[PDB]
C-alpha cells in the first residue's frame, strides 16, 4: 500500500529521459496521501519543485469545466439536453444549435475542431465563428477532441449561472472543493509558486491567452490541491450535496469510443485494465482524428478507472483514479513530454498497489 518504491522506479527516470526540468507526483491510497517531487521549477533559479508548486494542467482543466457544468445542471439553471441558443441568443437557429450541451461536453457536437482558427481572437469573433460553423457530421455520432467544444459548454454554464466563468470557477468550484491553491488567474500572492514551463527549444514559457483559455485549458494547480480533487472524485460523499452531484456528474459514461468511454471531462476504462488498453484510449489518433462514438447507458458497477491527460506548450499533466479501490495519482511536469510515458508511469504505480 506504499507507492514510494514504484514511484521512484516509474517517475524518477523520466526527467533525464525527456529533459524535464521538474515534476511533482501525488498518490492517494485509502485516504493516505504520498507526495514525491523531482527537479526544479525553473532552470534559471533551480528552486526545487514542491507539492505547492503551481503547474499548468492544460486539458485536465476540462474536468473542472465538466464539474461546473454539473453544478449548473444540479442547480437546474441548465439541462444537458438543452441547445446553445437557449442561453446565447445569437446562436439560435444556427447549424451548431442542433447540438445539445451534452454533445459539447463529449466532443460529439458535429466536428468542432481541436482549436479555434487563428482568426478567432475575441468574444465577437467567437460568436461569429460558431454562427458560421458548418458541422461535418450529425451530433452524437463522431467524437472529435475539441477545445472550442468544451470551451463553449463552460461559457454557457457561466451564462446560465449568471456570472463570469472565471469568478464562478474560482469561488463555487475551486474554493468550494477546498482547492485554495488552484487558479484560472494566479493571484499576485501565489505568483511566487508558479513554475516556468519549458518548450521544445527549452525556452521558458507559460500558457498564452486565447479564446476560451480559462474554459478549456487554463487552470493552474498543485499536487496538494489536485490530489484533494482526486480524493473528492474517489468519494464525493463528504461534499455538500450541490458539489457532490457536480462531481458525480463527471463520472457518467455517455459514449463508447473503441477502448474508452467518454464522460463529461473524464475518460473511463474498466479496472484492472491492461496498460495497452489505456495507451490505445490515450493515443494521438484518439486526440487528433474523428472516431465513431456509440451512445451507451452509463456503466455503474464494479471497478472503473477514470483519467484525463493535459498539456500546454510548456507543461504536461496526467490524473487517474479508481473509486472502488480508493487509489489515485496525479503527475504535473514543466515540460510537455509524450503522453504514453505519463500513462505508463502512472499505470505502473497504480498496478503495484495490491
Active site residues per annotation:
59, 145
Residue from 53, 59, 65, 147 touching Cl ion (CB under 5 A): that is 147
Number of H helices, E strands in the chain: 13, 15
Please tell me the count of residues contacting Cl ion according to CB under 5 A: 5
* Residue 115 interacting with Cl ion (CB under 5 A): yes
CA–CA distance, 167 with 3 (Å, rounded to integer): 37
Nearest CB to Cl ion, comparing residues 73 and 317 = 317
CA–CA distance, 146 with 106 (Å, rounded to integer): 9
| Options 4-12, 49-57, 115-123, 164-172: segment touching Cl ion (CB under 5 A) | 115-123
* Residue 190 interacting with Cl ion (CB under 5 A): no
* Residue 275 interacting with Cl ion (CB under 5 A): no
Provide the residue count of the chain: 354
In the bound complex, what is the minimum distance in angstroms from residue 326's beta carbon to Cl ion? 33
In the bound complex, what is the minimum distance in angstroms from residue 345's beta carbon to Cl ion? 28
* Residue 116 interacting with Cl ion (CB under 5 A): yes
How is residue 325 written as a grid cell?
479501490
* Residue 186 interacting with Cl ion (CB under 5 A): yes
Query: What Rg value do the Cα atoms of the chain yield, rounded?
Result: 19
Backbone interruptions in the chain following residues (C to N > 2.5 Å): none
Helices (H), the chain: 4-10, 14-18, 61-75, 101-105, 123-132, 147-161, 165-168, 213-217, 223-234, 241-248, 275-281, 284-288, 339-352
* Residue 250 interacting with Cl ion (CB under 5 A): no
Nearest CB to Cl ion, comparing residues 33 and 115 = 115
| Options 19-27, 143-151, 240-248, 269-277: segment touching Cl ion (CB under 5 A) | 143-151
Q: Which residues bind Cl ion (CB under 5 A)?
A: 115-116, 147, 185-186
Amino acid at each position: 500500500a506504499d507507492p514510494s518504491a514504484a514511484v521512484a522506479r516509474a517517475f524518477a527516470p523520466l526527467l533525464d529521459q525527456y529533459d524535464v526540468p521538474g515534476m511533482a507526483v501525488a498518490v492517494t491510497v485509502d485516504g493516505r496521501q504520498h507526495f514525491y517531487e523531482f527537479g526544479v521549477v525553473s532552470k534559471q533559479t533551480q528552486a526545487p519543485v514542491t507539492r505547492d508548486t503551481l503547474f499548468e494542467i492544460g486539458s485536465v482543466s476540462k474536468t473542472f469545466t465538466a464539474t461546473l457544468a454539473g453544478y449548473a445542471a444540479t442547480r437546474g439553471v441548465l439541462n444537458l439536453d438543452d441547445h446553445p441558443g437557449r442561453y446565447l441568443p445569437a446562436l439560435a437557429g444556427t447549424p451548431i444549435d442542433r447540438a445539445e450541451l451534452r454533445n459539447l461536453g463529449t466532443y460529439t457536437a458535429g466536428g468542432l475542431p481541436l482549436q479555434f482558427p487563428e482568426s478567432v481572437t475575441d468574444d465577437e469573433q467567437m460568436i461569429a465563428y460558431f454562427q458560421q460553423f458548418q458541422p461535418v457530421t450529425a451530433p452524437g455520432k463522431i467524437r472529435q477532441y475539441s477545445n472550442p467544444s468544451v470551451g463553449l459548454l463552460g461559457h454557457i454554464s457561466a451564462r446560465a449561472l449568471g456570472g463570469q466563468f472565471t469568478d464562478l470557477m474560482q469561488s463555487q468550484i475551486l474554493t468550494g472543493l477546498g482547492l485554495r491553491r488552484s487558479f484560472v488567474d494566479v493571484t499576485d500572492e501565489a505568483m511566487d509558486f508558479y513554475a516556468w514551463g519549458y518548450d521544445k527549444k527549452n525556452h521558458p514559457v507559460r500558457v498564452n491567452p486565447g479564446v476560451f483559455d480559462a474554459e478549456a485549458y487554463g487552470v493552474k494547480s498543485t499536487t496538494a490541491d489536485m490530489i484533494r480533487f482526486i480524493e473528492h472524485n474517489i468519494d464525493p460523499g463528504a461534499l455538500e450535496p450541490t458539489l457532490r452531484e457536480a462531481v458525480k456528474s463527471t463520472q457518467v459514461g455517455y459514449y463508447k469510443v473503441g477502448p474508452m468511454v467518454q464522460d463529461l471531462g473524464w475518460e473511463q476504462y474498466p479496472y484492472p485494465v491492461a496498460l495497452d488498453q489505456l495507451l490505445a484510449g490515450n493515443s494521438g489518433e484518439m486526440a487528433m482524428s474523428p472516431q465513431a462514438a456509440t451512445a451507451i447507458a452509463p456503466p455503474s458497477v464494479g471497478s472503473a478507472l477514470f483519467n484525463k491527460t493535459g498539456s500546454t506548450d510548456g507543461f504536461g499533466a496526467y490524473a487517474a483514479f479508481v473509486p472502488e479501490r480508493r487509489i489515485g495519482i496525479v503527475m504535473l511536469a514543466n515540460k510537455n513530454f509524450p503522453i504514453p510515458a505519463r500513462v505508463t508511469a502512472a499505470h505502473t504505480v497504480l498496478d503495484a498497489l495490491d
